[PDB]
């Protein structure tokens, strides 16, 4: 699978709010591009004159993420995050010459990454009562990846002393994501697990967080939740569920070729992470079935 590479697998079946350290930093920021940022401001420009109902807004940026040696008491995971913005994306990573843009921060900075706006995304394997994992249909009119299966998510938009603020919103955010789209009370929803960070290859490169979120509805009941809310509740076209059993070969199938990098990331963790027991009683054959 070439368009998702994983940065992080987290420990523990994934960690919870309180194991979790950020760093918000201007050090953690984009680089100046070598023949200045005025080339975004082009870009935009000739955006905002086509489309004059566009706006900014701010976007966490992921520079890094160091976990603790495993088995370790206290905090397990920082994160180095810095700041940037829709228009820094639509100038770098969505740029024909986004390649280009790898290349000389290999050369400059060595780091591939340097010159990108790398925006952080959230996203949920969401698991109903019953054991279905939540599926969506991305529309065939929208920008990026048109008319593929997606999973919950998006990219939070901004408001260990300003770290903890920061990550409170990360998991507030992933919920919030749920809520808005599948139409969902909050309070049928556990307090999410970060399962890891996967990079979206078909997008120069930017991560996203991808978190486990239980759900006390049955998949007919978030069904009923997603429909009662109408065509101008939600951005997808369509909400449908696999059995948790049947994930597990999803790479296998033909859903896999309709899956977009972000959902991707978000199975193979899951299967990672939450899937693929290690102890004696869920890895016995009846219950680990071979291949
Ligand atoms: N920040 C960020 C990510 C983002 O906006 N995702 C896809 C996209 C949306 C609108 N236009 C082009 C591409
Ligand atoms: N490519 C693509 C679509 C996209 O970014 N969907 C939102 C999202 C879903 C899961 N993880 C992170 C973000």
Same mark, same amino acid.
Not at 275 to 281: K, V
């Given at each position: 699978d070439p368009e998702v590479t994983l940065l992080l697998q987290c420990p523990?079946?994934?960690?919870? %709010? /309180? %194991?979790? #350290? =950020? /760093? !918000?930093?201007? =050090?953690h920021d984009r680089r100046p591009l070598p023949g200045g940022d005025e080339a975004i401001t082009a870009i935009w420009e000739t955006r905002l004159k086509a489309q004059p109902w566009l706006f900014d807004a701010p976007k966490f940026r992921l520079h890094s993420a160091t976990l603790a040696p495993i088995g370790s008491?206290?905090? %397990?995971?920082? !994160?180095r995050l810095g700041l940037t913005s829709y228009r820094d994306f639509l100038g770098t990573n969505w740029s024909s010459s986004a390649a280009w843009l790898r290349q000389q921060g290999a050369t400059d900075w060595g780091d591939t990454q340097a010159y990108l706006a790398d925006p952080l995304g959230v996203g949920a394997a969401l698991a109903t009562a019953d054991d279905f994992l939540v599926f969506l249909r991305r529309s065939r009119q929208v920008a990026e990846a048109p008319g593929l299966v997606d999973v919950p998510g998006g990219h939070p938009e901004p408001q260990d002393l300003a770290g903890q603020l920061v990550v409170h919103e990360l998991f507030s955010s992933v919920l919030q994501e749920i809520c808005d789209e599948v139409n969902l009370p909050l309070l049928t929803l556990s #307090?999410? !697990?970060l399962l890891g960070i996967a990079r979206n290859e078909t997008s120069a490169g930017r991560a996203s967080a991808e978190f486990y979120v239980q759900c006390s509805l049955t998949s007919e009941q978030v069904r009923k939740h997603y429909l009662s809310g109408g065509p101008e509740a939600h951005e997808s076209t369509g909400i449908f569920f696999v059995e948790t059993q049947n994930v597990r070969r999803l790479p296998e199938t033909e859903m896999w070729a309709e899956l977009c990098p972000s959902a991707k990331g978000a199975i193979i963790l899951y299967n990672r992470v939450q899937?693929?027991?290690?102890? +004696? +009683?869920l890895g016995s054959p009846a219950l680990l079935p071979p291949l």
């Open positions: 523990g079946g994934g960690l919870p %709010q /309180e %194991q979790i #350290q =950020a /760093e !918000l930093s201007p =050090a008491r206290g905090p %397990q995971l920082l !994160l #307090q999410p !697990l899937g693929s027991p290690t102890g +004696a +009683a």
